[PDB]
């Protein structure tokens, strides 16, 4: 009753990083951080298991650029096993591509097309191949006018190098495999120096799990599917429901990976640790709908901080999931103890966010600006890696002026 | 006047190159006139067509400077006669 | 980890200024500040070292009426050394004046002219004289109708007294030396008595230094110019490449004035000065890039009393660059402990200020009216002069109200 009122909290715009003493440039600044033993990342950045934000587009995107990206629950348990799966698989350089017959018409090629492939292969027992190129010269008429004759194909099991050349030498960038290797397909290969990858070299990827009877079998298809981290995300973690569920998953499947439900106490932190949870992910109210309608929230930069304290005293991982706005504000909420930020709003409009609908363009763009205010930041803050910018950098009180 | 007098010439005199020349110096001729395809002559004299040279050729090839006579079509090399339609 | 947010930080709006008891009024206050033993102005301000601000006639508005201007570094070595030199010889009473021939035309002279000079002197190897008022009288026709039989002319080494006078008598305002003097030259040679000087009588004028490869060349040419100050201007001053420019420059140049980049803590206040620099330039974020970009900042007016607390220890200057809006900014600057205050995007719209192009007339006008609002603070504080303003006054903290 007494310490009723005591408390105090911060938020970001309450703070400013203090420039120190800087012996590295913003881009020599090592931004790789290790949730766990087995979920590393070369950049502290997360795509949201929302809806708006995060399918095997993002995921992929994500991972391929250093962060990460967790596949949204609102779909079947099915589906988001195959979105996992679809994560999981690519980066391979196609066992299954889209076919068509002699008997269909080029208006069918183009609209499988637009759907953004370049070549379609020409029933259920290789004929030819169409592509965009063959479009210029065509007038729907019918896909039988097609590359017929000169038609190069590989064996399967050519090797990359085994290719790269038979496209150089016939000037094709299509290749099947009587499967199919483009030159996209090999070029992507080395684009993303940077990608996150397990230890089979896969790309890393999460999946979204709520509280409900079923997510002990969701679970188990996402396991099944090798997802890399299981998100048990809920509005309020420190719930009984949810210290329970996460529990439960760890004692049935020991070494895999766990992100558990929002919490914004260090008291909050120790109940999701205790119960099994690897990464605890922090945001309760970061004028949103949870101090408008239940009176409840946690300044984002207090709840990071007293979240990431008591975490590693046990040696575990804080996400910070809350009102990141700017570039500058993940600084600061790495700065407060968080090994990562989650990102929703800001890569809902992206080019690989789900569906068609405010378009931002590819997610690389928003990504690259949010990690260069990073790098900017840790540069003022002499920042050498991410422990550096988490355990030595100070903040100034700013009144709101 | 003269310029809209002269503007359909019908190019009876084409840009051409040789195997000599470096895959730059088609380059060259492509982005200056808003080119997109040089015709490979065997001698500057007895101009005899033996190639031809375009950008989707260039994009299969890292930037180098090798004979354009190995970068160059000439196996499956179309052309047509004088006064087709 | 727990000093990490203990740090509160004051900006310009945070403070008032507390009225004391006064035995001065405001114009018989003292506005000089010695920055070094050989860089004393007789007005705190110095326009800032950017493009749009300080070029030559910026830094000669400037220090004729006792401040300083910092020649911008977005221009080659040549040119910049160029523009100091143009300032170090100016308020002489010129060696290389204008000129045409007889061949040219009236519509080459006007143009000459429009490009502020009234008087144009008339090949290799003088026949008439050129003004505005024979322009009245004229229809650009030819040069050769110009004043060319009453010729006044003087020698070369003839006293300014020798003048105003030979000028009065013949009511002409050009005298050509077979060089030139004209009557704004004599003119302004006295409307400026607060001018700030060298020892030997010369504007004073800054150059500004980055850390690049050739900087070192750079400093050489200002140095071979005559500069008086030379200014390491970088974002981040704190980091080991510009201690290191500093030192470097310091070892070669031992009596060369120094200031050096943007810093905003004492601990790096004492790293600039154990480097070698004469005076620190204080401002880092004082909603501007550094802010929402990298979430790096510290409040203005905390910044200059910690960064001058820490640098009247070694005996050394503080100048305050960042923030100032009103002129009432800069006696809070001030008395914060700054000895300077630096402004650039005051100054940039004004008519001395580089380029064409939002237009504010004379810079005169804006420097009467910021050193104006400085007279009426300290005359409310009882400041005798700049030190006691830095010394004793005192401030209020206010809430927002
Ligand atoms: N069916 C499918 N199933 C699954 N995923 C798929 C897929 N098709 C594409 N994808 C995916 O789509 C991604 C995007 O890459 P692509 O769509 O391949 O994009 P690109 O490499 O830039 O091709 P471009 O658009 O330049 O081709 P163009 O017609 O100009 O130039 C192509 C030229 O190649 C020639 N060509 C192709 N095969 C030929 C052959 N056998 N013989 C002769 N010419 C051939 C054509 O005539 C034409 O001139 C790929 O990475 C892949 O993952
Ligand atoms: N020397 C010259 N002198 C004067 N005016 C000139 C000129 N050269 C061009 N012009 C003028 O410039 C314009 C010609 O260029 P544009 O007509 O404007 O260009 P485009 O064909 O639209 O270019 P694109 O990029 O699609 O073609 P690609 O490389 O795929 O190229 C076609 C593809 O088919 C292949 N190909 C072309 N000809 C071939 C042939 N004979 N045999 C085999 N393959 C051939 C190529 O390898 C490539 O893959 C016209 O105004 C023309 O009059
Ligand atoms: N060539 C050059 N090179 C470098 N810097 C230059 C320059 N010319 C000017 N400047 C600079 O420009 C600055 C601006 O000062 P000015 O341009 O001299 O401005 P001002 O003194 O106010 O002259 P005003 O505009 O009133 O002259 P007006 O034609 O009415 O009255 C002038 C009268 O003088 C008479 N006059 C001049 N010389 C005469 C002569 N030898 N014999 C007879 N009459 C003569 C004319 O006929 C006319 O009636 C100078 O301080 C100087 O630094
Ligand atoms: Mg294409
Ligand atoms: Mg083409
Ligand atoms: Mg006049």
Same mark, same amino acid.
């Given at each position: ?35 766990? /033993? ?11 298991? %929302? ?31 195959? *979105? ?20 269909? *018409? ?39 006018? %097609? ?20 496209? *150089?030498?016939? /000037? #094709? ?11 996209? =397909?090999?070029? !992507? ?26 997510? %002990? ?10 997802? =890399?981290?299981?998100? #048990? =995300? ?46 605890? !992910? ?21 709840? #990071?901080? =007293? ?16 009102? #990141? ?6 600084? !600061? ?30 997610? +690389? +763009? ?17 920042? /050498? ?5 988490? +355990? ?10 | 006047? &003269? ?21 730059? &110096? ?6 200056? @006139? ?29 930037? @180098? ?21």
């Amino acid at each position: 009753w007494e310490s009723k009122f005591s408390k105090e909290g911060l938020t970001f715009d309450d703070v400013l990083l203090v420039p120190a003493k800087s012996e590295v440039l913003p881009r020599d600044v090592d931004l790789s951080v290790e949730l766990t /033993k087995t979920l590393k990342l070369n950049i502290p950045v997360i795509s949201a298991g %929302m809806d708006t934000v995060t399918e095997s587009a993002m995921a992929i995107a994500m991972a391929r650029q250093g962060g990460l990206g967790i596949i949204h629950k609102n779909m079947s348990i099915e589906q988001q096993a195959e *979105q996992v799966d679809k994560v999981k698989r690519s980066e391979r350089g196609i066992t299954n591509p889209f076919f068509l017959t002699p008997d269909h *018409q080029v208006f069918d090629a183009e609209h499988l097309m637009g759907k953004r492939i370049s070549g379609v292969p020409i029933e259920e027992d290789l004929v030819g191949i169409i592509t965009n190129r063959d479009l210029r010269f065509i007038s729907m008429k019918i896909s039988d006018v %097609m590359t017929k004759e000169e038609l190069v194909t590989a064996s399967v099991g050519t090797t990359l190098d085994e290719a790269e050349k038979i496209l *150089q030498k016939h /000037k #094709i960038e299509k290749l099947p495999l009587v499967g199919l290797i483009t030159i996209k =397909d090999i070029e !992507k290969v080395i684009e993303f120096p940077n990608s996150s990858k397990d230890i089979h070299g896969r790309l890393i990827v999460g999946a979204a799990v709520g509280v409900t009877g079923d997510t %002990m079998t969701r679970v188990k298809k996402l396991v099944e599917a090798n997802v =890399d981290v299981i998100v #048990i =995300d809920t509005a309020h973690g420190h719930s009984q429901g949810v210290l329970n569920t996460v529990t439960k998953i760890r004692e049935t499947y020991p070494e895999l990976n766990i992100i558990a439900g929002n919490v914004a106490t260090a008291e909050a932190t120790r109940a999701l640790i205790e119960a099994g949870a690897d990464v605890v !992910k922090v945001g309760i109210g970061p004028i949103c709908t949870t101090r408008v309608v239940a009176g409840v929230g946690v300044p984002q930069i207090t709840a #990071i901080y =007293d979240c990431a304290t008591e975490a590693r005293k046990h040696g575990k991982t804080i996400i910070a999931d809350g009102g #990141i706005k700017f570039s500058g504000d993940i600084t !600061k909420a790495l700065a407060a103890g968080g090994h990562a930020v989650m990102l929703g709003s800001l890569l809902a409009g992206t080019s690989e966010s789900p569906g068609e609908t405010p378009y931002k363009g590819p997610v +690389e +763009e928003t990504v690259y600006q949010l990690v260069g205010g990073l790098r900017s930041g840790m540069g003022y803050c002499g920042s /050498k890696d991410l422990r550096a910018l988490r +355990e030595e950098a100070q903040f100034i009180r700013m009144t709101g002026a | 006047v &003269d310029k809209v007098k002269r503007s359909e010439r019908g190019i009876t005199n084409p840009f051409f190159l040789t195997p000599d020349h470096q895959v730059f &110096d088609a380059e060259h001729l492509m982005g200056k @006139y808003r080119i997109s395809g040089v015709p490979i002559v065997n001698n500057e004299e007895d101009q005899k067509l033996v190639g031809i040279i375009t950008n989707r050729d260039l994009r299969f090839i890292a930037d @180098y400077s090798m004979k354009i006579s190995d970068v160059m079509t000439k196996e499956e090399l179309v052309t047509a006669s004088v006064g087709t339609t």
